[PDB]
Enzyme design. Sequence first.
Site, short mmCIF file in Angstrom:
data_model
loop_
_atom_site.label_atom_id
_atom_site.label_comp_id
_atom_site.label_asym_id
_atom_site.label_seq_id
_atom_site.Cartn_x
_atom_site.Cartn_y
_atom_site.Cartn_z
CB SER B 1 -0.96 -0.01 1.19
OG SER B 1 -1.78 -1.16 1.16
CG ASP B 18 -11.17 -3.73 1.01
OD1 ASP B 18 -10.22 -4.52 1.19
OD2 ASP B 18 -12.28 -3.87 1.56
CB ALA B 80 -19.37 -10.69 6.93
CB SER B 82 -13.49 -7.87 8.28
OG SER B 82 -13.34 -6.60 7.68
CB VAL B 83 -11.59 -3.92 11.01
CG1 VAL B 83 -10.91 -2.95 11.97
CG2 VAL B 83 -10.55 -4.67 10.18
CG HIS B 87 -14.01 -0.11 7.87
ND1 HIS B 87 -13.75 -0.34 9.21
CD2 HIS B 87 -12.81 -0.17 7.24
CE1 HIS B 87 -12.45 -0.48 9.38
NE2 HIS B 87 -11.85 -0.38 8.20
CB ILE B 88 -19.12 3.55 4.58
CG1 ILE B 88 -19.68 4.19 5.85
CG2 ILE B 88 -20.21 3.38 3.53
CD1 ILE B 88 -20.40 5.51 5.62
#
Lengths: 112, 101
Positions: B1, B18, B80, B82-83, B87-88
């Site tokens: 990244s 992402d 689901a 994940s963190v 987050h959107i």
Amino acid sequence: APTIFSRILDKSLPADILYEDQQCLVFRDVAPQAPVHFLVIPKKPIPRISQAEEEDQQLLGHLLLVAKQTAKAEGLGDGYRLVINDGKLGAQSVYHLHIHVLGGRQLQWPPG
Amino acid sequence: SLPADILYEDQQCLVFRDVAPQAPVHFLVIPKKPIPRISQAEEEDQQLLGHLLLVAKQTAKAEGLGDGYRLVINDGKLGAQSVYHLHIHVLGGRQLQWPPG
Ligand SMILES: [Cl-]
């Protein structure tokens, strides 16, 4: 001009309404994709999220808060998913802004 | 990244690609305030939450998503998520299916 949500809003089409205030309305989706599946819509007929503007900031936040409050009321404590579809590639069904709330089963990934 | 993978930043939020994309365009809008889950947002977050949605749609336009896209917020295990930070997800660049997972 008006979509079918205009009939939901004016009560001419009966719906299972979970929440209502002067800004928004929440009702069950009649083509449900999960054991709990409801829609949060503004009364202001913003057609799609891409057409929202800065003046809609408060309203948009309110829609999200109403979605999560209603999710709790509907017993979605083990988790859920919020979805907003824009345009054709998003598979937007009705051209009046709506947040889908899905719960009561495991949601998969990718999200469509 | 790389730093350019941050598509947008202000005092309220960060937007970044992402690294496990599910579409040709797939990015993530997060608040700087550490709201862990949408179910744990509160009334005081009203303006912030609206800002996140506006930033999502603004960034979608900047990313060339003019034929439609999808916003997704996951809560908890059944969602689901994940963190455990809000987050959107914004997905575009292909036809999205229905149901959305
Ligand atoms: Cl997530």
